Design a protein around this ligand. Structure first.
Ligand SMILES: [Cl-]
Ligand SMILES: [Cl-]
Ligand SMILES: [Cl-]
Ligand SMILES: [Cl-]
Ligand SMILES: [Mn+2]
Ligand SMILES: [Mn+2]
Ligand SMILES: [Mn+2]
Ligand SMILES: [Mn+2]
Ligand SMILES: [Mn+2]
Ligand SMILES: [Mn+2]
Ligand SMILES: [Mn+2]
Ligand SMILES: [Mn+2]
Ligand SMILES: [Mn+2]
Ligand SMILES: [Mn+2]
Ligand SMILES: [Mn+2]
Lengths: 97, 108, 96, 84, 97, 78, 92, 103
DNA sequence: ATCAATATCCACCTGCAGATTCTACCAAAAGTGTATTTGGAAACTGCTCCATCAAAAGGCATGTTCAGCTGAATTCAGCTGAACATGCCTTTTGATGGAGCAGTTTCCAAATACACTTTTGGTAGAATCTGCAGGTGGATATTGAT
DNA sequence: ATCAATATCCACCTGCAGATTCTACCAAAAGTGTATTTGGAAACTGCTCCATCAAAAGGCATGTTCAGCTGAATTCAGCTGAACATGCCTTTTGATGGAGCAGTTTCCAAATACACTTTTGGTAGAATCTGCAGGTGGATATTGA
């Protein structure tokens, strides 16, 4: 009237949503171009198998999702609920990266 | 030559005792290969896939599906303390993650 | 122009019927399984290789695969695998 | 064909946010989207470099999913589902 | 009567201990501990003078390296005092838990 | 025995680790981590000892256990 | 007995610091080092040949293995030192 | 010998016998024992060149394990190649987080 | 920073002890010159796969407005962990003895690698078969203004 | 402690994309007979490893006395969700042209396999330095004032 959900409610809706699914959260075409950009910047006239670009997105999204989990722990240990660059660098550092 | 039983049958296994015996010699793991290694190694391979499929298949049950899929394989892996330890560094394509939120994050 | 490439699918599916008779397995899921099997087969033989080597021993026996498995697999998982292998081996020597 | 540049900005704010969700993240500071693309760039950079190193060595022009699988394995970041 | 502010001695110890390489655990107490832990896996085992030291060596590098990270977390939590939470956070992001 | 690893020894370690102030619960928290570490490594080492049919654990068993536990040690053979 | 690269490290030592000396404990660090590197490189060349179906490890492998393991700049010098080593060899 | 021919101070021959015997492939090229030998020598000189510096820096002529530790840890590139390696009696590089400093 | 009194810490020798560097000689490689053997680099070529392209729909990325409630700045005080002077029992030394036990080695029977021949279990595709994905529709179950 | 606006639920549908069931051919297990080879069973055997004896001198365990830090309260400025409107860029479809794998055959250049004969790297045993561990003496870094 106009009805509106409160800050955090929808976020939690999405967390619960994406944890029950397993589809790639990053858009395809946009990701293929990034793969081609970087590769091409190491060697040229390179072709990519359909599934090669896919074996990368799977690994990439599985890395970040897993990194955001660690990052979350650091924020929560910082008595916060909002993740920040600060936490990613601490996770990666502890991770030995 | 009379009847020729397969080494797997002689072992009582479903996995290929011959194929494994072969994958070994051409893998360059050592110069020679005793006849009981491919057998013993095929026996462990089968037991493990049997353990994983059992939980996976249970995963599929707990969700009205009758065909195992990646997501089911993952739920089994991340829920069995053991497999999880055995494959903590393995990432399963199309598997997703275990539903789980930190408490501090839920509302009052 | 053959091209044929092996796979463990035939054996995974057999074992599947044994545990869950009423259940089928999607292709992508069988894909994960093969990877899983080659993975472990690699971990175990690799360890086996290393073990037989550390001992100036030129052969990988049922005794290597057995240590490889104890070093590789944790607790129960290991205790059962070790049984299944022994059982399978003695059954094979008994020429059974 | 056409010059590829700035494709990292292709990994949009929406997409990343989504990944944090799966990762169980509730709130995201404004600065995290760019620190993410950074991390993401390095990750791909390292995996591709090795994938490609495997291609150049096999005398190919086509990077295979096997090249990528072998590259991730080296990174101690093993993948299942494309092994074949 | 002369006294030092709490912390002053600490820093002195930190600096001293980052210059030396000697093992920071008493040998015997440790060799006694090793024989025990190992006693529950096999019986009456002998130990090379070098096996016991290999462990002590590897071991002390694990804790030192683990206190390093633990400290980053304590500091990340805007504290200066490490606590089990920090050791717990570190070992987890590391994948040891 | 694990109580053999003294408080000051743990303090000394953390010092090398750059730790200024130590909470009182760290000490018992450290010993468990210490034990789990040694249980994991010894179990692997003795599995090589036992495999090589010997009654003595050698630096080489420790070195190989550590190598495969991801704790490569330089200085005792390999 | 128990052979070790020990004697060679000393030689190489002398070329860079003919005035310096090394400790028995430091010498052990240098062998564990050579063995490690030796394993990781041998290892990848082993794998490389297997992915491609080859049955012989050749300088080609050893070099791609080096590329894959040694950090950026260190890898180059090594690729060089290594390509040189073979040239001088094949020649005479 | 093959090493003097390759011009190396490292046992090309011995390296060859180790490759063939450590199960790596059925065959082994003639240059591989040479190449790998050259590669093992380069990295060796590099570390020694740095550890030697580190000893001199400390007013010493004999390189101990501590010198190999300071030599490696203080090099971004050897560090990256040995990050998962621990040098016995190496100790750690001196480093104290700012916040921990007085005043 | 001042003025002073602790302790701490940095330096320039000093002098043995203990690792080290340098000798003196022997098996186990490492080299050689033959004698095949064969792995995999060319020389096309069949033919999957990939890079392009056009096209119409609409599923999402983009910006902007609004303001809830989160992160960061402050003030505070109970009380936890540091700095110490104290007192002692247990870890560090260290020759010595005694002997378990890694190695060494020596055979030899069981266990393997070879080789040349068959003999089927698999795999690449036709063919038939059926979970369930994507659509609806209630009916529940969850939020949040009041 | 309601009620209204959504979001979630989960039972029913229905043939399509994606299984799983035959079907056909070999690539590769399984078959026998040889020609080494492995690596255990007894014997020993020097050599590291426990166990002793037994003290000395530390460190480690204790009990005080605060200096400081950590964690609890309070605020509030404004960063960062939730919602909404607009419309762009990805999706999904359906071929197409070769770019470049994967395959099939030829042929050395190069590797393995013996046999025979230099050399070298590894032992023990001398044969000596590099620094540790300790003294003084002298500025320093600290904490009270
Ligand atoms: Cl930040
Ligand atoms: Cl066997
Ligand atoms: Cl805590
Ligand atoms: Cl070669
Ligand atoms: Mn069942
Ligand atoms: Mn051939
Ligand atoms: Mn406001
Ligand atoms: Mn707050
Ligand atoms: Mn005896
Ligand atoms: Mn058949
Ligand atoms: Mn549905
Ligand atoms: Mn007070
Ligand atoms: Mn062409
Ligand atoms: Mn000599
Ligand atoms: Mn001194």
């Amino acid at each position: 009237k106009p009805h509106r959900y409160r800050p955090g409610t929808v976020a939690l809706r999405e967390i619960r949503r994406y944890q029950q699914s397993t589809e790639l959260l990053i858009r395809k075409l946009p990701f293929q171009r990034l793969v081609r950009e970087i590769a091409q910047d190491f060697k040229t006239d390179l072709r990519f198998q359909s599934s090669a670009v896919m074996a990368l997105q799977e690994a990439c999204e599985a890395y970040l999702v897993g990194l955001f989990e660690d990052t979350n722990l650091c924020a929560i240990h910082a008595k916060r609920v909002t993740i920040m660059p600060k936490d990613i660098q601490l996770a990666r550092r502890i991770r030995g990266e | 030559r009379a009847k020729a039983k397969t080494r797997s049958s002689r072992a009582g296994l479903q996995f290929p005792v011959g194929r494994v015996h072969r994958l070994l010699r051409k893998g360059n793991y050592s110069e020679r290969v005793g006849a009981g290694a491919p057998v013993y190694l095929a026996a462990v391979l089968e037991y493990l896939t049997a353990e994983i499929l059992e939980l996976a298949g249970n995963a599929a049950r707990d969700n009205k599906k009758t065909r195992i899929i990646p997501r089911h394989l993952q739920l089994a892996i991340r829920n069995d303390e053991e497999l999880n330890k055995l494959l903590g560094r393995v990432t399963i394509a199309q598997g997703g993650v275990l539903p789980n939120i930190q408490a501090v994050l839920l509302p009052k | 122009k053959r091209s044929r490439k092996e796979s463990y699918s035939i054996y995974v599916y057999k074992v599947l019927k044994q545990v869950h008779p009423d259940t089928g397995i999607s292709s992508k899921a069988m894909g994960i399984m093969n990877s899983f099997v080659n993975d472990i087969f690699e971990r175990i033989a690799g360890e086996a290789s290393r073990l037989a080597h550390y001992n100036k021993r030129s052969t990988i026996t049922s005794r290597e695969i057995q240590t490889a498995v104890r070093l590789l697999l944790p607790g129960e998982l290991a205790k059962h695998a070790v049984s299944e292998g022994t059982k399978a081996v003695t059954k094979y020597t008994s020429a059974k | 064909r056409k010059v590829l540049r700035d494709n990292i900005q292709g990994i949009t704010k929406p997409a990343i946010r989504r990944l944090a969700r799966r990762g169980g993240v509730k709130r995201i500071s404004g600065l995290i989207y760019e620190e993410t693309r950074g991390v993401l760039k390095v990750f791909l950079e390292n995996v591709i470099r090795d994938a490609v190193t495997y291609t150049e060595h096999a005398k190919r022009k086509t990077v295979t999913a096997m090249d990528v699988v072998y590259a991730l394995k080296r990174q101690g970041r093993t993948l299942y589902g494309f092994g074949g």
